[PDB]
Amino acid sequence: KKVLLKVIILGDSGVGKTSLMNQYVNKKFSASYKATIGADFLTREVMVDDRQVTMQLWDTAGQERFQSLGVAFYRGADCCVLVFDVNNAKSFDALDSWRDEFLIQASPRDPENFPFVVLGIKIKRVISTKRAQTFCQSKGGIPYFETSAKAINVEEAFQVIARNALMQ
Amino acid sequence: IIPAQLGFLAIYNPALGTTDETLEDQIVYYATASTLSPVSKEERHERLRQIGLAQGMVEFAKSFSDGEPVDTIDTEKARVILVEVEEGWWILASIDLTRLPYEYSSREVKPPSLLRADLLRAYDLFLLHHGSSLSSLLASQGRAQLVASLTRFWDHFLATWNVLLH
Amino acid sequence: ERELDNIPDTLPDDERLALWKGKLKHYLILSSAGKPIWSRHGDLSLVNSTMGVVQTIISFYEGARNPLLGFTAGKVRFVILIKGPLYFVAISRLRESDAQLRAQLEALYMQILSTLTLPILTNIFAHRPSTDLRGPLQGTESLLASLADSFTKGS
């Protein structure tokens, strides 16, 4: 049977998660519901070694009125992606609040080894690369990638997070 | 035993608020059982959630129904009615069922098709005394006056509207 | 093309999603996490986004402590059946009542049941051979007696 992974995309609203996922995911199967019920539901096929993996992508809206529903959004998640804008300092500072709220609401098995990936979106930047890696290294060595909406490292970031989910 | 009553009613138009900063502008009228007798952040979030969920269910079901919107929702504790009274303008009404010790019943409650006809007649009645349409009124007298006009009418109608058969 | 035809994998994704949405009758089984378990039509790549939408809609009403039973859009009826972590959805353009759809979901649940329970029950008794099931079966004795009496009356 084909492997299925539930992947949560977290980040502050307006960071650029929608435009970024548009380049990656299969648009033909997307379901756009961020403003209504709090998430876009995306999907994409990922190759990890010989195995072909189908990813179920939950791109959360991040708006305040959906916070209580985080228990249902994150339930059963296999891995989580943390997104920030390198020019928006507030989006970087929120990465610690999103990760902690994810661990509390999702309450996953093996929390210290749960797969995470941090993504920095590029477009003069405020957050340095080393300051982002120090936070990633601080949280158990989270893989860090930088990309632009114009692809790039997004494909590698998801092959890494998919590989770490299959190890568990 | 608590008899069935009107839980909440909303009139919204998605075209009036297409960005997240202006989402609450979609709502031109909102009444709860408590309001029929100062809106907090939690209450505002809840209204946006009720109206967003209705739109999401509409968007979802249109894929299977050849574009037809959701018109009736059946929950354990409420009977929910959704009617597009004119192009773009929606009435969402949630009727709390009869609470008996609790256990919930819809035997006394009007059928969904009847509640819908009541809301349409009230809509027809409101226009008869004010203008041609909600869209025409919005342009002629503006948002503030239309909302004030809708609040006077619907508050009085919802106070007397009987959701039971008799 | 026809209702009981399988949706071709070789077709472009637009037509496949078009064929899937046009079916008269859908049966959807998903976990409380939104992960697809079984669909009468369509493959994993095609239905999983619909599963997430369905799990989220159901979750709003769970969060409100007011479970969702079903809804109607035009000539289409949606029926929801929740059995613990398993979410059952029937979507029908046929003239089927809510009670008929709910019974059909109940039957699919029993088919899932027989397949899953015997392995996990065997695995449990393998780790704890002394397991006494009289406790977790308390209250069902009345139903067991009635079912046995239905057979005895037939003779």
Residue numbers in the entry:
A (entry chain C): 5 to 127, 133 to 159, 161 to 178
B (entry chain B): 12 to 48, 92 to 155, 183 to 247
C (entry chain A): 199 to 353
Verbatim from the authors:
To gain mechanistic insight into MC1 function, we determined the crystal structure of the catalytically active CtMC1core bound to the nucleotide-free CtYpt7–N125I. The structure was refined to 2.5 Å resolution revealing two CtMC1–Ypt7 complexes per asymmetric unit. Mon1 as well as Ccz1 adopt the typical longin domain architecture, with Mon1 harbouring an additional α-helix α0 at the N-terminus (D211 to G220). In the asymmetric unit the C-terminal α-helices α3 of both CtMon1 molecules are swapped such that a dimer of the trimeric CtMC1–Ypt7 complex is formed. The interface of the MC1 complex with Ypt7 is mainly formed by Mon1 (∼960 Å2) with smaller contributions of Ccz1 (∼450 Å2). An additional interaction interface is formed by the ‘elbow loop' between helices α2 and α3 of Mon1 that interacts with the α3–β5 loop of Ypt7 (∼350 Å2). Interaction with MC1 leads to a dramatic remodelling of the nucleotide-binding pocket of Ypt7. Switch I is moved 18 Å and switch II 8 Å compared with the active conformation observed for ScYpt7 in complex with the GTP analogue GNP (guanosine 5′-[β,γ-imido]triphosphate).
MC1 has been identified as the GEF for Rab7/Ypt7 and localizes to LEs1216. Our study shows that MC1 forms a heterotetrameric complex with specific localization domains and a catalytic core that acts through a unique mechanism, thus representing a novel class of RabGEFs. The enzymatic activity of MC1 is mediated entirely by a core complex consisting of the longin domains of Mon1 and Ccz1 plus an extra N-terminal helix of Mon1.
